[PDB]
Every structure is written in structure tokens, then in C-alpha cells.
Design a protein around this ligand. Structure first.
Ligand SMILES: Nc1ncnc2c1ncn2C1O[C@@H](CSCCC(N)C(=O)O)[C@@H](O)C1O
Length: 371
């Protein structure tokens, strides 16, 4: 074991294929959720697959959370979780049958079990649940949707982007029950597929969702949603689902709002609603600035990008469209300036370095990008 620091937390990680997983590259992901929790202030929270326990520990040390649950099915992880918790908190970690509880300023509950089992035991109990598995979160989604309060918050990560970006079509259908789209738009389509599957699974509980923040980064998808209580709210949520049509020869996309598509070659279903709560994300940029984060600079760069990013379905990739149409194109910075000069909204997007979010119709965009 070796000592490592992330944010205000000091933890021990196995030195090495490792007995307990820890990825420092995910410190940024952790920072983001920490920043968000400092805005929404959920009291009772769950770190469902904590591994070393770093997430829940940071929740306890850096957010207003009052009761923090850390869980993992692995005995090795559980043992390390207890050790790392006592490395950051004083008091008596009372253990009994695979569960250790510390009742200090903040109450910490370390659990050893299947996340589905723990969440089933804690029905309508958490104000916030963070699902951060190895790959897909689908094995845990339905139960989390029952474990969180009817107005709770859900944080979901999908690490395997192969099915979501269209590389593995078969798997995407099986796991997300949606038809993926490969290419320059896959980072967003995959993100919208994730939000859409959450909305779809939630509906049967007479719950709807409002997206707080959903983004893509370094080959992983993240989505934070606020559960809405009510059948009608569930109805209205499903009405925000839709499909995407994409022309491989031009890069032009079409949107179709509706539970089912009505034309061939449709992609989805996907969430066609907003991918961010403008006000909350605005506050997040400010909060990240007044907080001691693990990767403050990277956190702010991503948050600022998303904050200024136009929230509209999809975008146009200058490089990709140039290739599909077989034409020379202008630089992104120039194209944005030109679009704005013509009276159209246009911004860069975190989904792709060469992508441009704009209100401009496809044909106006093409005429603008042409060398
Ligand atoms: N059914 C299950 N219930 C609870 N944990 C599970 C599980 N199946 C797999 N896991 C596990 O999930 C892992 C995902 S790695 C997770 C990391 C993280 N949440 C962070 O920020 O560090 C392992 O620690 C592990 O044993």
C-alpha cells in the first residue's frame, strides 16, 4: 500500500491486476461531482461501487452531505475502504456483519455487498446516488431508480464507450436498448442515449427527469439527473425522447421527436431535451473556483466550456463534413465568428474539438465553412 492524496482526502492504494481499483485520471470526474454536490446539497448520499472509497470519502470531506454510504462487493475493497476512512476521520468505526458505521459530525457507513442488494434494502432513501462501475451501469440502474428518493439525484457513469459510440452495435442494443450512431457525433449521441435510457427506466415508477448535467470526457459518459415525482412528469419526460437521422454523404442530421421513429435508418432513442441546467452549471463554474479541487484547472476548463456551450441537439463537425462532401473548409474560430456575424448563435463544444454548436441551418453552415 502507498499513500496518495486527492482533494482533501489522503488514501492508501494497493501498489502493483491490482486487488483494489483506483484511477487518478478519474480525479476530475470526482471533482465535478464534488462541485455539483456543493450546489445541490444532498444530505444522504451513496457511493455504490467505491473500490478504495475515495469518492464517498471526498463526499464526506468536501460536501454538505451528512450521511455517506460507501459500498463494494469485494472483500479487499471493503477492508481498504474501512482503513482509508479511518485515515481521514477520527472516532469509533463500529463493525458488525460486513457493515462498519462511524457516527461523527458526518455519519459514514461502509458496506460490503452487491450494490443491487444494498440499494434494494434502502428503498426511497438516498438524496443522491453515484453509480460509477467498471464499464456499464445498466446492471444497477433500475434498483438505483428505486433506492433514490422520488425527487432524488442520480449520477451515472458509463466507462465503456464502445457500445455508446457505435463501435459495438449489438452490445448497445442489448445494454441500452438503442441504435447507436458512429462518427463525429457519437460522443453526443452516446451521451443522449445514456440520458434516454435513464428516462425510460424511470417512467414506470411514475417519475420523470430533468437533466442537471450530462457530458462526455476521455472516453467515458456522465449524466446527472434530478428525479421528478409524478405520472404526468413521466409522460412529459418520455415526450422529450426522439430519434436522429444522419446522411453519411453530407453530415446533415434530422431530428424526430416521438416515442417511435417513422422513417428508416433512425438512430436512438435518444434524449432530445437539454443536456444541462444552465443556471446550475453557471454556479458550478463559480463554485469550482472557490473550492480546493484535485484538478482545479482541468475542472474549470471543462466546466467553462460546457457553461458557454450552446445547449441544442447535436452539431456540425467542420473536418468530418469537409471529408464527406469532399470540400475544403475554414478554421473553426473563423467559422464561429462568421456565423455570429450573420446573426446566428454559435459556440465550440466539449463533445469534439472540431465541432460547432449552432442555430444555423445545415445549408447556411456549409456555405459559411466553404473555403
Ligand atoms: N455487484 C456489485 N456491487 C458492488 N460493487 C461491485 C459490483 N460488481 C462490481 N463491483 C466493483 O466495482 C468496482 C468499480 S471501480 C470503481 C470506482 C470509483 N467509484 C472511484 O471513484 O474510484 C470495484 O471496486 C468492484 O469490486
Amino acid at each position: 500500500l502507498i499513500e496518495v492524496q486527492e482533494g482533501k482526502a489522503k488514501i492508501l492504494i494497493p501498489k502493483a491486476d491490482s486487488p483494489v481499483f483506483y484511477n487518478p485520471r478519474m480525479a476530475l470526474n470526482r471533482d465535478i461531482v464534488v462541485v455539483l454536490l456543493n450546489i445541490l446539497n444532498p444530505k444522504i448520499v451513496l457511493d455504490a461501487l467505491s473500490a478504495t472509497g475515495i469518492r464517498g470519502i471526498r463526499f464526506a470531506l468536501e460536501t454538505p452531505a451528512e450521511e455517506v454510504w460507501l459500498n463494494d462487493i469485494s472483500e479487499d475493497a471493503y477492508e481498504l475502504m474501512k482503513r482509508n476512512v479511518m485515515l481521514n476521520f477520527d472516532g469509533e468505526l463500529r463493525e458488525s456483519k460486513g457493515r462498519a458505521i462511524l457516527k461523527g459530525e458526518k455519519t459514514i457507513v461502509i458496506n460490503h455487498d452487491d450494490a443491487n442488494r444494498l440499494m434494494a434494502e434502502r428503498h426511497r432513501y438516498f438524496h443522491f446516488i453515484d453509480l460509477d462501475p467498471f464499464g456499464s451501469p445498466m446492471e444497477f440502474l433500475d434498483t438505483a431508480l428505486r433506492s433514490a428518493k422520488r425527487r432524488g439525484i442520480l449520477g451515472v457513469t458509463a466507462t465503456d464507450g464502445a457500445p455508446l459510440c457505435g463501435a459495438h452495435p449489438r452490445a448497445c442494443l442489448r445494454k441500452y436498448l438503442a441504435v447507436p450512431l458512429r462518427g463525429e457525433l457519437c460522443h453526443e449521441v452516446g451521451t443522449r442515449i445514456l440520458v434516454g435510457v435513464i428516462a425510460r427506466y424511470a417512467a414506470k415508477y411514475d417519475l420523470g427527469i430533468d437533466v442537471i448535467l450530462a457530458y462526455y470526457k476521455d472516453h467515458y459518459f456522465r449524466a446527472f439527473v434530478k428525479l421528478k415525482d409524478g405520472a404526468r412528469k413521466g409522460d412529459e419526460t418520455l415526450e422529450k425522447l426522439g430519434y436522429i437521422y444522419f446522411d453519411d454523404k453530407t453530415g446533415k442530421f434530422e431530428l424526430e421527436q416521438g416515442f417511435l421513429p417513422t422513417r428508416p435508418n433512425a438512430y436512438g432513442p435518444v434524449w432530445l431535451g437539454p443536456l444541462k441546467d444552465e443556471k446550475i452549471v453557471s454556479k458550478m463554474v463559480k463554485e469550482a473556483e472557490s473550492l480546493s479541487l484535485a484538478r482545479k484547472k482541468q475542472a474549470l476548463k471543462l466546466l467553462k466550456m460546457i457553461d458557454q456551450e450552446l445547449d441544442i441537439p447535436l452539431f456540425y463537425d467542420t473536418h468530418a463534413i469537409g471529408r464527406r462532401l469532399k470540400i475544403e473548409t475554414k478554421k473553426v474560430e473563423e467559422i464561429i465568428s462568421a456565423l455570429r456575424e450573420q446573426g446566428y448563435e454559435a459556440t465550440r463544444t466539449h463533445f469534439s474539438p472540431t465541432g460547432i454548436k449552432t442555430s444555423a441551418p445545415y445549408e447556411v453552415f456549409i456555405e459559411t465553412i466553404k473555403r
